[PDB]
Write an enzyme that holds these catalytic residues in place. Structure first.
Site, PDB file in Angstrom:
ATOM      1  N   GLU A  99       0.807  -1.212   0.000  1.00 60.00           N
ATOM      2  CA  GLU A  99       0.000   0.000   0.000  1.00 60.00           C
ATOM      3  C   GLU A  99       0.846   1.270   0.000  1.00 60.00           C
ATOM      4  O   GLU A  99       0.592   2.187  -0.774  1.00 60.00           O
ATOM      5  CB  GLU A  99      -0.920   0.069   1.226  1.00 60.00           C
ATOM      6  CG  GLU A  99      -2.175  -0.798   1.207  1.00 60.00           C
ATOM      7  CD  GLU A  99      -3.119  -0.531   0.033  1.00 60.00           C
ATOM      8  OE1 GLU A  99      -2.982   0.499  -0.656  1.00 60.00           O
ATOM      9  OE2 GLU A  99      -4.019  -1.375  -0.202  1.00 60.00           O
ATOM     10  N   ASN A 157      -7.518  10.153  -5.924  1.00 59.99           N
ATOM     11  CA  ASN A 157      -8.304   9.430  -6.917  1.00 59.99           C
ATOM     12  C   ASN A 157      -9.176  10.480  -7.601  1.00 59.99           C
ATOM     13  O   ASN A 157     -10.204  10.900  -7.064  1.00 59.99           O
ATOM     14  CB  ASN A 157      -9.200   8.388  -6.241  1.00 59.99           C
ATOM     15  CG  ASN A 157      -8.411   7.396  -5.407  1.00 59.99           C
ATOM     16  OD1 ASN A 157      -7.585   6.642  -5.934  1.00 59.99           O
ATOM     17  ND2 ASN A 157      -8.644   7.397  -4.099  1.00 59.99           N
ATOM     18  N   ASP A 193     -13.263   9.637  -8.201  1.00 62.30           N
ATOM     19  CA  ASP A 193     -14.328   9.906  -7.244  1.00 62.30           C
ATOM     20  C   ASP A 193     -13.979  10.965  -6.199  1.00 62.30           C
ATOM     21  O   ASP A 193     -14.590  11.018  -5.135  1.00 62.30           O
ATOM     22  CB  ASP A 193     -14.766   8.621  -6.555  1.00 62.30           C
ATOM     23  CG  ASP A 193     -13.826   8.195  -5.446  1.00 62.30           C
ATOM     24  OD1 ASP A 193     -12.617   8.512  -5.486  1.00 62.30           O
ATOM     25  OD2 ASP A 193     -14.320   7.536  -4.521  1.00 62.30           O
ATOM     26  N   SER A 216     -11.664  11.221  -3.972  1.00 58.83           N
ATOM     27  CA  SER A 216     -11.287  10.766  -2.626  1.00 58.83           C
ATOM     28  C   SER A 216      -9.755  10.648  -2.566  1.00 58.83           C
ATOM     29  O   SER A 216      -9.086  10.673  -3.606  1.00 58.83           O
ATOM     30  CB  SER A 216     -11.940   9.412  -2.296  1.00 58.83           C
ATOM     31  OG  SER A 216     -11.371   8.340  -3.054  1.00 58.83           O
ATOM     32  N   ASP A 276      -6.400   8.451  -0.500  1.00 58.67           N
ATOM     33  CA  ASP A 276      -5.979   7.325   0.337  1.00 58.67           C
ATOM     34  C   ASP A 276      -4.878   7.863   1.231  1.00 58.67           C
ATOM     35  O   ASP A 276      -3.916   8.438   0.723  1.00 58.67           O
ATOM     36  CB  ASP A 276      -5.408   6.211  -0.535  1.00 58.67           C
ATOM     37  CG  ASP A 276      -6.405   5.693  -1.542  1.00 58.67           C
ATOM     38  OD1 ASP A 276      -7.552   5.427  -1.148  1.00 58.67           O
ATOM     39  OD2 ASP A 276      -6.049   5.555  -2.726  1.00 58.67           O
ATOM     40  N   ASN A 301      -8.913   4.998   2.666  1.00 60.64           N
ATOM     41  CA  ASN A 301      -9.692   5.937   1.869  1.00 60.64           C
ATOM     42  C   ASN A 301     -10.676   6.880   2.579  1.00 60.64           C
ATOM     43  O   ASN A 301     -11.509   6.450   3.391  1.00 60.64           O
ATOM     44  CB  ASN A 301     -10.396   5.171   0.747  1.00 60.64           C
ATOM     45  CG  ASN A 301     -10.977   6.095  -0.286  1.00 60.64           C
ATOM     46  OD1 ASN A 301     -12.139   6.481  -0.201  1.00 60.64           O
ATOM     47  ND2 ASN A 301     -10.166   6.477  -1.256  1.00 60.64           N
TER      48      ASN A 301
END
Length: 130
Positions: free
Chosen positions: A35, A46, A49, A51, A53, A60
């Site tokens: 990750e 991102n 959408d 958002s 992380d 998220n």
């Protein structure tokens, strides 16, 4: 903070992650490795959408933490996303535990499915004294 492998393994173990909801420490290590490369400051936007992380587990903002800028988002861990960018990973661990308490468990992270599920993850904790 970018953790060294065994440093992280012991940090996670002291935080009660070994076997949490049936998930071995080696699985958590493999997850953090893929990750964020063990980087607590890792962030990924991102555009799709709107958002982001956050942190070592790339949690998220659409569902887990609040950053105030994600449209119609939830904050299931009840944390400011900033808490997921600290050198101290206690809050990030508390949130990762929250994530896995849901139906999918460790499968919540697609990266885990891609790089850890049905893989030999022993190497992540070998020699760390855990």
């Amino acid at each position: 903070k970018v953790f060294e492998r065994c440093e992280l393994a012991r940090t996670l173990k002291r935080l009660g992650m070994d076997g949490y909801r049936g998930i071995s420490l080696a699985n958590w290590m493999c997850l953090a490795k893929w990750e964020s490369g063990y980087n607590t400051r890792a962030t990924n936007y991102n555009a799709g959408d709107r958002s982001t992380d956050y942190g070592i587990f790339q949690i998220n903002s659409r569902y887990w933490c609040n950053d105030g800028k994600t449209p119609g988002a939830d904050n299931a861990c009840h944390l400011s996303c900033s808490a997921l960018l600290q050198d101290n990973i206690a809050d990030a661990v508390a949130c990762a535990k929250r994530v896995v308490r849901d139906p999918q468990g460790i499968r919540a992270w697609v990266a885990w499915r891609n790089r850890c599920q049905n893989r030999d993850v022993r190497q992540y904790v070998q020699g760390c004294g855990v």
